[PDB]
């Protein structure tokens, strides 16, 4: 084994997820972009 290289892809793998996190956060929840979107309940209904 090259232990180096296997803890190198784990830490991309939870930069990618840090990455989901923050960019999600200013997609869905912003101020009430989760309950309403555009219509009230569903997102377009």
């Given at each position: 084994d090259?232990?180096?290289?296997?803890?190198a892809l784990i830490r991309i793998l939870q930069?990618?997820?840090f990455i989901?996190?923050?960019?999600?956060?200013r997609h869905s929840r912003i101020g009430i972009?989760?309950?309403?979107?555009?219509?009230?309940?569903?997102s377009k209904s």
């Amino acid at each position: 084994d090259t232990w180096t290289g296997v803890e190198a892809l784990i830490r991309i793998l939870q930069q990618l997820l840090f990455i989901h996190f923050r960019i999600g956060c200013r997609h869905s929840r912003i101020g009430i972009i989760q309950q309403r979107r555009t219509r009230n309940g569903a997102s377009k209904s």
